[PDB]
Structures are given as structure tokens and as C-alpha cells.
Ligand binder design. Structure first.
Ligand SMILES: [Fe+3]
Ligand SMILES: [Fe+3]
Ligand SMILES: [Mg+2]
Ligand SMILES: [Mg+2]
Lengths: 286, 286
């Protein structure tokens, strides 16, 4: 207590023995992840350049910045997995999932950097984008938020898994929606296809967070989860309307705000709680 | 002094930023690991049972004990990567390699456990084999040796990388050769095919170890490495001639002893050192 009372977190002397499977729900999530393995090299980028050059300058600006934000945020997610989640969780089934998630984050990061390298030849612009955590004010709020949760020496796994579900599910939702908006406009097949793989993968990662949360005996209160989630929505809404505005690609900022709230509601429910915002999904393409 | 002198181990604020790649040799090994991804589901075991039943009882004893040894050892390798190597190495390229190695070790353990479950239906025998670390004296020597290197608070990364190259390269070499002997004999295509995949991967994991060792500034002495490698050799030789004799599957115990020495020599050369034993490879099928 609290930890020796937690089956996910307590001493498992069989942690590195794989069989037999005890947690079938957790294990099938791992098999799902494993069965959808893909590499950056599988994405065909050979038709993207022509589409990229035809875009308006501010569209290229928005897209390059979303790419830089994704590439940077993956490393933070990865950091948390490597230093915290994969270490503290003791059941084999989740250890397998988290090990495969780490591998997939590296692939996601590579994919985003390949996209950057393909669209942007200027080495100074590349470096600017690769070092977005330092060079880009817009990503700072999100990046710092996620990083606080890694160094938080007091917050429970229950709270931290919620926080990273908000990272992978809320902090990414506006940017995913943006790339899907571009698909509606028939632009950049490489970008839009890779976007389908990564958002699927990220959805699975949030699904897994909720599954872990469910197996906790001592969950944080609804009030506590509410304040993490709302806080995250606010940061995301600001990111998308002020810091890096979605009108740069022709999107309605007001509907985007509503969508972030739809997303957070779906996550709240998946976590076994009640909706916070009670709004519908404005986007038919999501 | 002590470690801010080591490019592989010193502070890297770009640790979780993927691009640009700067250690191209290290990165190419990761791309090689990634390109050879496979899963247990790809290996067809349906044509092995008839061969399995045709064997002498001491052959089934041998194989199931080899399988149990491999499953147990994988989790120790895995533990080391999760708790030590993937944490302490700071270059992005190696962290990507090690992260992918962890995922592959989990696929290795699953493969071995699936082989056990497929060949052995008796629930009590399965549990005896899965708990090989506690239940099987033949594996104790190897398990404790490897485990000591994880617990060793004072040995350098340079020593430990060698120690785990000995684990994946020497402790596994006799068993891999055993399965290749079964291939020569035309027995159990599922086992022998999975064995091709896994020994290849383990070979790569050893190559990677030598690559990291090479990139160290403060290497251990040739004398000190000889000591680790010679020790590993004798443990493996005892394993295969006394604890679980390869005679049980028709192999010559003296030629096997020689094979281990040849493997160790190859590793010593790969580490930038001199041969120790100067013996030829007795096995034409290796
Ligand atoms: Fe993710
Ligand atoms: Fe290995
Ligand atoms: Mg277990
Ligand atoms: Mg880096």
C-alpha cells in the first residue's frame, strides 16, 4: 500500500518470464500493436513535392510547424516510457506493450523527420524545425506540460497515465484533424497516408492508457482527472487558435475548439468518467 | 572523468530528438534490425509434431530444455537492456537500436514459449520449463552469471557490453548449433526456421555490442576481456557437455567444446583483440 496493493505496480518475480499470459485484455492490445507494425520506408513520398510547391506559403508554414511539433512531442512521450512507464509497471503484458510503443515512437519520429527532410531542403530551416522545443514558442506550452509530468516525483502512475493519454490524445488531436482536413482538399498523399498510420497508432496508445487506468485499484478522483483534462484542452485550444492558427489552412477556429472538447469528452468516458463539455463532433471527416 | 569523457555516455540534450543522424554506422545497424522485423505468427509449426513424436525421449528432453534455457535467458538480456543499456547510453542512434532490440527479445521469448506450448501439452511440464531459472540446475550457472552483471554497481559499461556479448554470443552458441544439427538431420522445420531468424538477430545484437565497444574511449584491457570471455566459454562448455550433454541429440561433445572456443575467438577479434584458443570451426553447417 499503495503500491503492494496494486497488481500493475507490485513485485512480479515472473516479470521477465513471458508465458503464461494472465492479462488477456492487456496482451491482446500488445498483439494488436505488433500486428500493425510499419516502417517509415513503406510510405511513398515521391508525389508529395509537386503538391508541396503548389501550396500557399502560409500552408507550408503551418504544415512544417505541425511536423516539427509532432517530431518533438514524440521524444517526450518516448522519454516518459523509457524512464518511467516501462520501468514502474511490473506485469509482463504491459511491459511488452510499452516496449513496442517505444519502438513505434522512434518510427513515428523518424517519419516526421523524413517528411521535414523531403519538403524542406534548406539546412537552417531543418535545424530550426528539429530543435522546436527550443526554437518554437508555440510548442513550449505543450512540451513543458508533458515534461513536468515526467519529473513529477509525487504524482501517482494513475495521474501520470492520464496525463500522457492527454498528451497522445488531446495535444495531438488538433494537429491530426488538420492533416485530415488537408486530405479532404486532396493534398500530399505521403503526408496524409502517414497521418492515418500515426493517428491510428496514437489512438491505440490512448486506448492502452485507459486499459491500464481501469486495472488500477487506487484511481485518482473524477475531480482530479477533470482538472488535468480541462487544463490540457485549454493548452491545445490555444495552440490551435493563437500560437499556430488553423485558419492558415482554411479551417474554422471555432469548430476546431469544439472538436478538442469532443475528443476530451470521449477520453473522459473511456476512462470511466462523465463528459465535461457535452458537445458533438463538428468534423464529419473525423 | 568519470564519464563526461565518453561520447556514448555523456549528456546529450538532443537525446530524444531523432534527426539529424550523426553516428551513421550505429544508425545503419538499427535500420538493419528494423528491416528484418518478424513475428512468431509468421513461423509455421504445424509440420513439426510428427517429427517430434519420432524422436527418442532423451532428444525431446534435450530440445525442451534448450527451449526453456533460451526463454529464460531472453528475459535476462531484456532486463539488462530495459534497466541498464537503454538508460545509460545517450546517443539517439543506439537508444533506437536498443529499443528495437527490447521488442525483438520479447518476440524471441514468445517464439520460444510457443514452441514449448506446441510440443508440450502437459500443464505441469510447461510450468516446469517456463520457470527454468528456479527449476533447472543446468541453466543456473548461466542465469546467475548474466544476472550478476546487471546487479554489478561498479563494472563499466565497457565491461558489461562485453559480458552481454558473451551472453548472446557464447551462452547461446552451443544451443543454436544444436538446432542447426537438427536441421542437418531434416527434423522439425518450424523449430529450425525460427532458429535461423533468432540466431541471425542474436548475431546482429553481438555485432552491435562490438560496435559500441569500439566507440568507447576507456576500453577495458585485453587481459580483462580475455578473463570475461574465457570464463563464459567454460560455463558454456560445462553446460553442453555435463549439465545438458549434446550427446543426447547425437552430437560429439569434444567437437562442440571446440566450436565454443572458435566462437569466442571470433568475438575477441570482433572486439579488436587477439585470438585466445586458435582452433578451427569443427562444424561445416555453421
Ligand atoms: Fe504514441
Ligand atoms: Fe539478443
Ligand atoms: Mg510473466
Ligand atoms: Mg538526437
Amino acid at each position: 500500500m499503495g503500491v503492494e496493493d496494486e497488481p500493475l505496480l507490485r513485485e512480479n518475480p515472473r516479470r521477465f518470464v513471458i508465458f503464461p499470459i494472465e492479462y488477456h485484455d492487456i496482451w491482446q492490445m500488445y498483439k494488436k500493436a505488433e500486428a500493425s507494425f510499419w516502417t517509415a520506408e513503406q510510405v511513398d513520398l515521391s508525389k508529395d513535392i509537386q503538391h508541396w510547391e503548389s501550396l500557399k506559403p502560409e500552408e507550408r508554414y503551418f504544415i512544417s510547424h505541425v511536423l516539427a511539433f509532432f517530431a518533438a512531442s514524440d521524444g517526450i512521450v518516448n522519454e516518459n516510457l523509457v524512464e518511467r512507464f516501462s520501468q514502474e509497471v511490473q506485469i509482463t503484458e504491459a511491459r511488452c506493450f510499452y516496449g513496442f510503443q517505444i519502438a513505434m515512437e522512434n518510427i513515428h519520429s523518424e517519419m516526421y523527420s523524413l517528411l521535414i527532410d523531403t519538403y524542406i531542403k534548406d539546412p537552417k530551416e531543418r535545424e530550426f524545425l528539429f530543435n522546436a522545443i527550443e526554437t518554437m514558442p508555440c510548442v513550449k506550452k505543450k512540451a513543458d506540460w508533458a515534461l513536468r509530468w515526467i519529473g513529477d516525483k509525487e504524482a501517482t502512475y494513475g495521474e501520470r497515465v492520464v496525463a500522457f493519454a492527454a498528451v497522445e490524445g488531446i495535444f495531438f488531436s488538433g494537429s491530426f484533424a488538420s492533416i485530415f482536413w488537408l486530405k479532404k482538399r486532396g493534398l500530399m498523399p505521403g503526408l496524409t497516408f502517414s497521418n492515418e498510420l500515426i493517428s491510428r497508432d496514437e489512438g491505440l496508445h490512448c486506448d492502452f492508457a485507459c486499459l491500464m487506468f481501469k486495472h488500477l485499484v487506487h484511481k485518482p478522483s473524477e475531480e482530479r482527472v477533470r482538472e488535468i483534462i480541462i487544463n490540457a484542452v485549454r493548452i491545445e485550444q490555444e495552440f490551435l487558435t493563437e500560437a499556430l492558427p488553423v485558419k492558415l489552412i482554411g479551417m474554422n477556429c471555432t469548430l476546431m475548439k469544439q472538436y478538442i472538447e469532443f475528443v476530451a469528452d470521449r477520453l473522459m468516458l473511456e476512462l470511466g468518467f462523465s463528459k465535461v463539455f457535452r458537445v458533438e463532433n463538428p468534423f464529419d471527416f473525423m
